[PDB]
Amino acid sequence: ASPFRLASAGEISEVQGILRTAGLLGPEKRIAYLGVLDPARGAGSEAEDRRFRVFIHDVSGARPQEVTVSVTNGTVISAVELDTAATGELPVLEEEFEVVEQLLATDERWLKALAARNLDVSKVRVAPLSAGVFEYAEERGRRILRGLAFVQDFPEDSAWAHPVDGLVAYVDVVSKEVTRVIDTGVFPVPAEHGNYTDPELTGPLRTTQKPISITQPEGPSFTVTGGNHIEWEKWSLDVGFDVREGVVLHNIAFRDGDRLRPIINRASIAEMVVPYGDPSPIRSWQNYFDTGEYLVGQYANSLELGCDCLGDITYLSPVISDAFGNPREIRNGICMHEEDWGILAKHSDLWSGINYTRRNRRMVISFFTTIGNYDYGFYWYLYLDGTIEFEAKATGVVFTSAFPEGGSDNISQLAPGLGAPFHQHIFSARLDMAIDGFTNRVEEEDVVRQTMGPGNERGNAFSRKRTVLTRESEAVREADARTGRTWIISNPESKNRLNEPVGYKLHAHNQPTLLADPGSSIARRAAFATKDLWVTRYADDERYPTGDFVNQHSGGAGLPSYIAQDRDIDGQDIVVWHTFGLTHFPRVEDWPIMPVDTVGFKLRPEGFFDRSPVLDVPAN
Amino acid sequence: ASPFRLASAGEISEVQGILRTAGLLGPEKRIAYLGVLDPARGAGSEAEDRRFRVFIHDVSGARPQEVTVSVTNGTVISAVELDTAATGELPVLEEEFEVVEQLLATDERWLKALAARNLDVSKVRVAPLSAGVFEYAEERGRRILRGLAFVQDFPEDSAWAHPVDGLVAYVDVVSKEVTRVIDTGVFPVPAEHGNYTDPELTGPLRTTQKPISITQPEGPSFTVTGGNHIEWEKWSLDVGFDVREGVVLHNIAFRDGDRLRPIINRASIAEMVVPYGDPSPIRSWQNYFDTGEYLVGQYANSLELGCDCLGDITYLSPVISDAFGNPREIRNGICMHEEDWGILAKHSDLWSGINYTRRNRRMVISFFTTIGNYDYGFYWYLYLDGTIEFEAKATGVVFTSAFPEGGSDNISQLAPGLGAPFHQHIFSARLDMAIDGFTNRVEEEDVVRQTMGPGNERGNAFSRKRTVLTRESEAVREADARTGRTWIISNPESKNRLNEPVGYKLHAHNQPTLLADPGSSIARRAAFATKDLWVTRYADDERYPTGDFVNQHSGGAGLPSYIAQDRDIDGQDIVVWHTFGLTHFPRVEDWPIMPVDTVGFKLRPEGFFDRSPVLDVPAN
Ligand code: NI
Numbered sequence A, B: 001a002s003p004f005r006l007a008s009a010g011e012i013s014e015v016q017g018i019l020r021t022a023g024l025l026g027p028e029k030r031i032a033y034l035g036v037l038d039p040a041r042g043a044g045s046e047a048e049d050r051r052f053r054v055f056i057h058d059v060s061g062a063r064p065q066e067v068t069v070s071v072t073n074g075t076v077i078s079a080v081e082l083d084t085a086a087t088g089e090l091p092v093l094e095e096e097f098e099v100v101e102q103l104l105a106t107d108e109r110w111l112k113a114l115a116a117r118n119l120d121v122s123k124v125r126v127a128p129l130s131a132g133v134f135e136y137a138e139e140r141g142r143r144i145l146r147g148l149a150f151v152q153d154f155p156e157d158s159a160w161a162h163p164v165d166g167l168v169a170y171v172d173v174v175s176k177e178v179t180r181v182i183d184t185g186v187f188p189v190p191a192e193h194g195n196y197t198d199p200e201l202t203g204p205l206r207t208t209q210k211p212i213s214i215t216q217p218e219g220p221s222f223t224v225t226g227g228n229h230i231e232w233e234k235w236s237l238d239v240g241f242d243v244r245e246g247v248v249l250h251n252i253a254f255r256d257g258d259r260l261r262p263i264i265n266r267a268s269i270a271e272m273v274v275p276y277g278d279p280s281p282i283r284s285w286q287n288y289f290d291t292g293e294y295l296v297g298q299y300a301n302s303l304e305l306g307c308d309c310l311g312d313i314t315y316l317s318p319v320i321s322d323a324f325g326n327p328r329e330i331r332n333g334i335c336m337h338e339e340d341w342g343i344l345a346k347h348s349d350l351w352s353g354i355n356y357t358r359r360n361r362r363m364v365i366s367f368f369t370t371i372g373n374y375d376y377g378f379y380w381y382l383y384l385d386g387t388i389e390f391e392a393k394a395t396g397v398v399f400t401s402a403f404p405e406g407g408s409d410n411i412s413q414l415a416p417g418l419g420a421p422f423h424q425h426i427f428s429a430r431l432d433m434a435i436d437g438f439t440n441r442v443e444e445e446d447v448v449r450q451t452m453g454p455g456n457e458r459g460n461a462f463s464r465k466r467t468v469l470t471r472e473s474e475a476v477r478e479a480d481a482r483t484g485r486t487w488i489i490s491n492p493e494s495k496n497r498l499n500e501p502v503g504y505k506l507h508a509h510n511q512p513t514l515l516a517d518p519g520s521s522i523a524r525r526a527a528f529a530t531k532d533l534w535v536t537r538y539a540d541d542e543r544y545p546t547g548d549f550v551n552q553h554s555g556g557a558g559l560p561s562y563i564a565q566d567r568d569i570d571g572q573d574i575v576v577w578h579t580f581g582l583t584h585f586p587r588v589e590d591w592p593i594m595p596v597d598t599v600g601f602k603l604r605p606e607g608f609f610d611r612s613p614v615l616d617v618p619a620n
């Protein structure tokens, strides 16, 4: 079918065979990542080559390998051994989750720390946390996982309510050694439970909510063909899914009359990092790259009808590979539906006597993932007027600690003795731009204030200025909410009827960027997060802002390296990388389970059309 | 019943009778403004005293009067004659709108200007606009309206497509004299029509949109008692309606257990200003205060079921006074409904095996108004988690001009020869705070970055700092998006279970504030718009950020005068005034009719509750 169709179970199986029948797949080999590759840059590509990229880990301790197979041709295109100390470790394997707790349970240092706290080892849950890169020389080259303990009073108890502060362990997951156990001192383990389904906590449930029924008696207005191709209200796109990025949007275009006009070639959340701002050595190394290290697509939930997605929902069940190369389906992992969006346009004109009102609607493509204590909803919206928007919804259970006696400048109190370390959830949307084709350019537009005087005697004038970003070395931009700064992506060789380059304007939320000291390890490893907007020249090997192997990578791996190429981006095939995130100082209201907090960005047509593209929407 | 109930037709008729009886409402008198006053500050009130404030205009040129009557007691509490040259003219009367075009139709200077452009006077519409305060000394003390011409080719033609640039006229609407006709030169009058209902422009209407039905089989979850008292999912409030302010929310409180806890005593949009940034003399005086000068409430549309408000809607039809004191009902002028709001909270816990998902909902209270070419929707939202939000939706037809041949730094092109001068739509939300009562304070909270070194060896630490605003002189604040600046309103005498003062945090959108030069007439008249947040000590006569009389009134009233009192606001009855707006550089997509653009703000609980207030929300 389409070269952008979702990976089939058969294709995953065929990859497994190909790797097996080559000595790449076997006994101590585990697939840490597998995903289909996007078609190469071309126009008359009438020869389909479905290729898959795989990261293969070796349990014995042997060197991992990056292999690209061709499923169409049943071949191995490349297979390279990786020097992980140089290029970074492979993505954390799901099967290594339990390992940190298991190994620590027989460690005398650990057991001693628990005994001192009178904690039963069988009730101590341990979180498999990414290690990052700090001052531990012995960790370079080794696949380390750090562990923080949470007491679980019983099977259905929420362990997050009972953090064990003053203690942290480091574990080499291949040699299976507890490399270290640090105990800075005993902290009271918070006693209150955070069991949000416990009637004693919830109280009598409300009986006041009457139903809100959302139906489509004639079915939805969008069509799904070729498994993942969507056609909706002039919009056209292909919904892809990657185990690392999650939902990826391909070929977003708009049928402007006779033309199917491209806007965005590929849209994805290429990275997601959660840096913590607690200077306690128990947590100061804590930075979770949910997308890069853990792979958010891998953990997508199976969304239930009527609970997660309301109304007329069309589901996609993406297929992924397990650690052995067998295909695993994520049933109902992606929701697709259209929802009413209030008033689109309205005017009651006195002079003409015409009263006009039209309703708005948006196509929604979403999924929800669970990464330990956090749960994130990723939502992509396409609007009738041409607006494209992304929204991330952060919920789950807050990552806890003990609340220090005498307070804290970096931790807030949730319950008696229970603290919540300050942190941020920072995202990177990778937008492979295609405004009316690939010849694009980006301009930074600032509102311009004018001084009262000659030519502006009443001092009421205000303007705007646009600065073209010509080389990558000038394409690392910061927000300026004060001057209403935005960035416009245009095609200098495609003019609208008023002879102006067609374009789309990116409206950012202007939330704070990475707060960590610039010389910090996280500042270097997640350099993308220190600036709001980056523009690079497209390159098939530049996929993530943090690089291909984020786990225990030293620093400067992605964007800072690409940007260093200083390529021409003025009227070229370019990619926009927008950093946006939430800064959290958890409140009592976030405990025991946090209500959704949101962040995102949007792009609106800016002289893309010759007039409003919604004049043909009826009153119905 | 409740002293916060909406004005009834009988009450308005009684005010008329009381005024007539007092000799204050003879045949030459007109009611420019009539509204019910809120109950006085207190507790033990001795029965009801429904009072109404009225601004009385005199068509014969006599001085207007401000009068307060007690409709309950049949008395005039006060009546004072106004010196308009000093304190400001009364709001524009609806009847004076038609006067501008009518008077100009027989003016020879006007006729000559039209003849020079070959325009038929019977086809030239004149947009009657507020005058402002400029260098025209003869205007001081007179009621002036300025006029800009638009050609209307036929009865149902949209005149905005055909602006007549280079011409403007000033008219005294009382003495009925054209004071000035300015013609700076002819400009081609744009020829394309902007008729969005013309099949020739719309093209064939889409047949692709299938229905989205939203119903509530068991009715809505909120209850309406006493005409305007709403109770929904723990929230309690009274929906009032004022002709100047539009929808006003009273006594917003949350039922936390046995306690009905107040949050906001009164919330309204106390002012709106639309300044233009085109330095052409034809439009450089252009600034309307839709709320203050025109009274947005009197122009509220009657909303259509299914079109304007989709779902199970409960309408309020507010009653206002006509120019003579007779009651007039705005049928279905306010929509009240609850809408589904996606996911509220979600977590799939590995350790406990418990998968939890809850849906969100919001109570919506809204109205839409039309003032000339603009249509604005005002939306207030109450969420399950305790969040309060306001959203303004700006639509209608763009205010046009000619597009200068050699381009423009202050006007954009929409169609051939058609321009759209740059402008802003700035709002002022007046929040009379009552966080767990009237003893409140405001703190400005900035995220704090920390330097790597002693105490922060890994350079990951980040904090927050809060500065209490103690006196009015230090309560005029600006946004700082870069440092995640927010403002927290707390009650220093009411502490949550963790012994922290309860509070609510205001999250602003950090959009650009007033762009006009600080020395401009508009910067002084709309002084409130130059700053993001102001905090004043409550006073019953400090109602609007611009004063009681905005029309043709210079600086001297409003917030700048209030603030000078430098009152104590640290743990006192205080009022928060938040400026938030849209900066518009119209684009081709905004022509022929503008798709909705939005702006707003929200307040989220900040340690107000002892834990999440939505744990009792059913699975459903
Ligand atoms: Ni968080």
Ligand code: NI
Binding pocket: B394, B423, B425, B584
């Ligand atoms: Ni506008």
